[PDB]
Amino acid sequence: MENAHTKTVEEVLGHFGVNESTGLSLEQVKKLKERWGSNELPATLLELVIEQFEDLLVRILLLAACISFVLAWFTAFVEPFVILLILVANAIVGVWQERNAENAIEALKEYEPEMGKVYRQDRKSVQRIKAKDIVPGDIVEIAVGDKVPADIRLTSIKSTTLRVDQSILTGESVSVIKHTDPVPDPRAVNQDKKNMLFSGTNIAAGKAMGVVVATGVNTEIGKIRDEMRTPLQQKLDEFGEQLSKVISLICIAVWIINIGSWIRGAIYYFKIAVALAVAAIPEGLPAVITTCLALGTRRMAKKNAIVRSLPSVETLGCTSVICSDKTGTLTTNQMSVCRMFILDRVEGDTCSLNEFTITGSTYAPIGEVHKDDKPVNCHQYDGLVELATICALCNDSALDYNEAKGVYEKVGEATETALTCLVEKMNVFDTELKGLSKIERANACNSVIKQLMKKEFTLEFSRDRKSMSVYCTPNKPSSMSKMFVKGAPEGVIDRCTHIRVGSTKVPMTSGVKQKIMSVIREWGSGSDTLRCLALATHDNPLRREEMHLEDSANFIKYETNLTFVGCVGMLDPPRIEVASSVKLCRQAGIRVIMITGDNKGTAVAICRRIGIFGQDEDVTSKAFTGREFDELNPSAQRDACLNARCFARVEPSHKSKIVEFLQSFDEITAMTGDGVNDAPALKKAEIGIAMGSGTAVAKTASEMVLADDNFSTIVAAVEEGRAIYNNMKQFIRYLISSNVGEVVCIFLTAALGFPEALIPVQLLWVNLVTDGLPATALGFNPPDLDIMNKPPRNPKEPLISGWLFFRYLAIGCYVGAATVGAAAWWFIAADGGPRVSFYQLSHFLKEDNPDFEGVDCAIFESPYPMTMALSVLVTIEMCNALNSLSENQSLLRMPPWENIWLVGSICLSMSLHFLILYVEPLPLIFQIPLNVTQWLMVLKISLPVILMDETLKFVARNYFVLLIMPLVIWVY
Numbered sequence: 008m009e010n011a012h013t014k015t016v017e018e019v020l021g022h023f024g025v026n027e028s029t030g031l032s033l034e035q036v037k038k039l040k041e042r043w044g045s046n047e048l049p050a051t052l053l054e055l056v057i058e059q060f061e062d063l064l065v066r067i068l069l070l071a072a073c074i075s076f077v078l079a080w081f082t083a084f085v086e087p088f089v090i091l092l093i094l095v096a097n098a099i100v101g102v103w104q105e106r107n108a109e110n111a112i113e114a115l116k117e118y119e120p121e122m123g124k125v126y127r128q129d130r131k132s133v134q135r136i137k138a139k140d141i142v143p144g145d146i147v148e149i150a151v152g153d154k155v156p157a158d159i160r161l162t163s164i165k166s167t168t169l170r171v172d173q174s175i176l177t178g179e180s181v182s183v184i185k186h187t188d189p190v191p192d193p194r195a196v197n198q199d200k201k202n203m204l205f206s207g208t209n210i211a212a213g214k215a216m217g218v219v220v221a222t223g224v225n226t227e228i229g230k231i232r233d234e235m236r237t238p239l240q241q242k243l244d245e246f247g248e249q250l251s252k253v254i255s256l257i258c259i260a261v262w263i264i265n266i267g268s269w270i271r272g273a274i275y276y277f278k279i280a281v282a283l284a285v286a287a288i289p290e291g292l293p294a295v296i297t298t299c300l301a302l303g304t305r306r307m308a309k310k311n312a313i314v315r316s317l318p319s320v321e322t323l324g325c326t327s328v329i330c331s332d333k334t335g336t337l338t339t340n341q342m343s344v345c346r347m348f349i350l351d352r353v354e355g356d357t358c359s360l361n362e363f364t365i366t367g368s369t370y371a372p373i374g375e376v377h378k379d380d381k382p383v384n385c386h387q388y389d390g391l392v393e394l395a396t397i398c399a400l401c402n403d404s405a406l407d408y409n410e411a412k413g414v415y416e417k418v419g420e421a422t423e424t425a426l427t428c429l430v431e432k433m434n435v436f437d438t439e440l441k442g443l444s445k446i447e448r449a450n451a452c453n454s455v456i457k458q459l460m461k462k463e464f465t466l467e468f469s470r471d472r473k474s475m476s477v478y479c480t481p482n483k484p485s486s487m488s489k490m491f492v493k494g495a496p497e498g499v500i501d502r503c504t505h506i507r508v509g510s511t512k513v514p515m516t517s518g519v520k521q522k523i524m525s526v527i528r529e530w531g532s533g534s535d536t537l538r539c540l541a542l543a544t545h546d547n548p549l550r551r552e553e554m555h556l557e558d559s560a561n562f563i564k565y566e567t568n569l570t571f572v573g574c575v576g577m578l579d580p581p582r583i584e585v586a587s588s589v590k591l592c593r594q595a596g597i598r599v600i601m602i603t604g605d606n607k608g609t610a611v612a613i614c615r616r617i618g619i620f621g622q623d624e625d626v627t628s629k630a631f632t633g634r635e636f637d638e639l640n641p642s643a644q645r646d647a648c649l650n651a652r653c654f655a656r657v658e659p660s661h662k663s664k665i666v667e668f669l670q671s672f673d674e675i676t677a678m679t680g681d682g683v684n685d686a687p688a689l690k691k692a693e694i695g696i697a698m699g700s701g702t703a704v705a706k707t708a709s710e711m712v713l714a715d716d717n718f719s720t721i722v723a724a725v726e727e728g729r730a731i732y733n734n735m736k737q738f739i740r741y742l743i744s745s746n747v748g749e750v751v752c753i754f755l756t757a758a759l760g761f762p763e764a765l766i767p768v769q770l771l772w773v774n775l776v777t778d779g780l781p782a783t784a785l786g787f788n789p790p791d792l793d794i795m796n797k798p799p800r801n802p803k804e805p806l807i808s809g810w811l812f813f814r815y816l817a818i819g820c821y822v823g824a825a826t827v828g829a830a831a832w833w834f835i836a837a838d839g840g841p842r843v844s845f846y847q848l849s850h851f852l853k854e855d856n857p858d859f860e861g862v863d864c865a866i867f868e869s870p871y872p873m874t875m876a877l878s879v880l881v882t883i884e885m886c887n888a889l890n891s892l893s894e895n896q897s898l899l900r901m902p903p904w905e906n907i908w909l910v911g912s913i914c915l916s917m918s919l920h921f922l923i924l925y926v927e928p929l930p931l932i933f934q935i936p937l938n939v940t941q942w943l944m945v946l947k948i949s950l951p952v953i954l955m956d957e958t959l960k961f962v963a964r965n966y967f968v969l970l971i972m973p974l975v976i977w978v979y
């Protein structure tokens with residue numbers, strides 16, 4: 008079947024020989040799966056390796072590896088080789104971490120098979136099957152929120168209008184409108200295919216059914232499968248540019264003051280200002296950020312949270328407002344009518360009711376109606392036969408038994424599905440239900456109703472009108488059509504001009520209208536926090552011939568002069584872990600707002616339950632309806648958002664505008680939503696969160712999907728986001744505060760006229776050792792002990808602080824007055840070696856010199872005090888690295904064994920530094936045999952940078968040993 012849209016409806020129905028209302032036979036599926044395979048897709052090798060070197064810091068440090076190798080034919084290659092080993096080492100961590108997380112996100116999406124609603128011949132009702140079991144033939148049904156599972160030709164549209172979001176397939180950011188007439192153009196583009204749906208795209212409004220015409224690869228989305236920065240990064244890429252600007256400054260600022268063949272020898276000092284450049288250049292800044300960001304995506308994918316955009320975690324470390332949809336998201340969406348009432352009698356102003364309770368918290372259609380905790384037969388209550396009529400004929404939902412889980416599931420919206428379940432429990436027509444199975448009883452009594460009443464068309468739901476009409480005619484006429492409605496109570500009773508009392512109608516009164524809203528206030532504020540709907544019927548509707556449904560704004564006009572019948576009260580439990588989250592957030596410095604279209608009375612009562620409010624807290628300033636907000640003065644309407652914690656009876660435009668107002672206050676907002684109404688607010692907010700059980704359009708439009716439906720996962724992402732930015736700051740403090748020393752070790756050396764500090768092969772070794780995997784592995788750092796007890800980060804404030812700058816000199820100056828303080832100790836105050844005086848040492852730049860009496864000028868050509876400064880900078884920078892586990896938490900509170908990966912790193916970079924000083928062929932390649940008398944001093948010197956930085960920690964903070972102390976006692 009090619010170009011179905013050329014062909015008409017019955018044509019494509021003939022091609023598969025299916026009845027539209029029956030669907031595909033059982034072996035017809037067997038054959039067709041043997042002719043088109045499943046409905047799935049079978050999902051570079053070294054490209055990840057090459058992507059690491061695409062960053063500025065390793066693009067330029069790829070040059071220094073070839074510049075010092077330019078001079079190879081002129082040790083010579085040991086300089087460029089050591090620049091590789093720090094670039095190669097960091098580049099391997101990232102590709103490792105990246106492939107770790109990749110499998111994870113692909114492990115979680117695979118957990119949940121995408122179901123899809125078909126019409127095979129076994130069950131007389133719609134049923135949910137795995138997407139891959141769909142074949143080109145069976146009738147398929149979809150509705151608002153559903154992703155399309157296969158390529159479908161439309162056959163019938165139940166709602167007035169159908170709206171598909173084809174963005175993922177075509178890119179058009181608008182919802183198109185479909186039809187069922189044939190498009191003749193046989194080469195028409197996907198966008199001009201207005202009678203077809205395609206996998207992966209979602210339904211924005213309406214509900215319809217068609218027949219599959221392609222699967223797997225043959226679908227438009229499959230046909231093109233093989234042919235297809237972050238807010239913290241721009242903060243670091245404005246940094247990576249600036250340091251190199253100062254690096255190459257200071258570096259060539261070294262190269263000049265030294266030169267003063269006398270010019271061919273000026274190319275030595277070039278490899279210095281080049282190697283010293285690589286030394287104070289963070290080769291691993293772009294690797295350590297791709298590391299941590301990949302890690303979190305793996306951390307979250309572990310907790311049943313698919314992260315769809317990588318900066319989601321980063322921004323969540325700063326969120327100060329987390330708005331959330333009530334129904335579905337903050338509630339389990341496990342609905343069942345447990346209270347209902349109709350009118351008993353009405354005499355004058357006063358009136359009485361006939362209330363009822365109904366058992367059964369599950370969607371399962373088992374339960375009984377009580378009057379006063381006593382069961383009753385509903386046929387005796389004439390008003391109940393009608394409430395039951397409305398509740399099954401205004402339903403776009405249906406019950407579907409899941410024989411795998413042995414439990415009942417919903418087909419459509421939970422709210423509607425609770426009603427289908429209720430009309431089963433009533434059985435107002437007293438049909439004999441004894442001989443029917445767990446599947447026949449999912450939609451049993453509705454069928455009797457739907458068999459007595461011909462539903463000719465429905466006027467679908469509209470969240471601004473907040474009600475849903477249905478047109479019907481009895482099957483034996485003579486012409487007596489009627490109209491049934493169900494909608495928001497406040498709204499429906501507004502349009503109700505009459506009330507039915509049993510089987511008779513009477514005009515609406517003030518007092519009657521009162522009682523209703525009190526029951527509903529009783530119901531929504533009670534221990535159950537009921538979610539209530541009104542149910543009324545129009546007795547003299549306008550003929551279908553004289554109706555105008557092209558403009559849906561007419562719908563509310565036709566739903567007028569109604570007869571009120573009754574109200575239902577369904578229960579909705581809050582999610583279990585939710586009351587903890589709002590406790591955890593108010594401590595992390597985060598506000599939690601509720602945005603809902605339901606009753607303010609009920610929405611507040613939930614907020615009282617879960618801890619947004621408390622039963623006694625006055626809420627007059629923190630809860631406003633949609634109307635109570637737009638009907639305010641702009642100043643009070645301003646500081647409302649500042650303090651309001653609940654917004655109810657609210658359309659998606661509001662939630663989109665609510666988040667907007669938060670953001671206009673420089674607030675970083677998160678949005679937690681389940682359904683279509685949350686779609687604008689999800690995109691609008693900085694980050695949107697969708698529920699796994701929710702809709703696809705809610706999931707697609709949002710940027711992180713809790714497939715768990717766990718609500719405490721949100722907090723964990725905020726800890727990840729706060730932990731990633733915090734790992735940077737220490738990593739920042741390490742390389743930055745440690746290289747002020749490598750510059751002063753050189754610049755102090757020049758100012759005092761001292762002997763040579765280092766050599767360009769030594770300059771790039773100590774870069775490798777301290778700035779290789781040791782520095783890099785700082786990203787696995789343990790989250791701080793009090794990370795979620797402090798307000799969130801404000802992104803517009805700068806990265807580095809003036810107290811932190813001061814802490815970089817206080818360790819940069821020290822590691823420099825320690826790198827050169829050890830080489831001067833071997834010339835002035837050492838036992839085995841020269842006793843050169845300070846004056847004699849600074850003017851060393853002759854046998855004739857009487858100031859240099861009794862000294863072989865050859866002692867300045869000795870590698871001894873060079874590895875006294877080389878192994879001091881390695882040891883002291885491993886020490887400073889051990890300071891860099893936390894900004895202020897000392898090593899008494901955060902011991903170094905908590906970070907396993909900086910430990911296993913420092914031990915590897917000392918195993919590679921100790922292997923260089925005592926092996927056979929290396930002390931000559933590196934110009935360098937140090938033992939106990941000298942290694943104790945390098946310990947005596949490199950260790951105080953532990954305490955010196957510790958005393959910085961102790962002062963900013965106020966505004967183990969069995970192992971530690973024997974090591975120090977040897978030293979002193």
Ligand SMILES: Nc1ncnc2c1ncn2[C@@H]1O[C@H](COP(=O)(O)OP(=O)(O)CP(=O)(O)O)[C@@H](O)[C@H]1O
Nearest residue numbers: 332333334468470473474475493494495603604605
């Ligand atoms: N299929 C449906 N038919 C008739 N009325 C419906 C309906 N679905 C919802 N309503 C009514 O619309 C009103 C508001 O609906 P809306 O879609 O804006 O939010 P909501 O009630 O579904 C709760 P939440 O916003 O937390 O998901 C509800 O009070 C309900 O009475």
Ligand SMILES: [Ca+2]
Nearest residue numbers: 286288774778
């Ligand atoms: Ca470096």
Ligand SMILES: [Ca+2]
Nearest residue numbers: 745746777778
């Ligand atoms: Ca360094």
Ligand SMILES: [Mg+2]
Nearest residue numbers: 334335681682
């Ligand atoms: Mg919802």
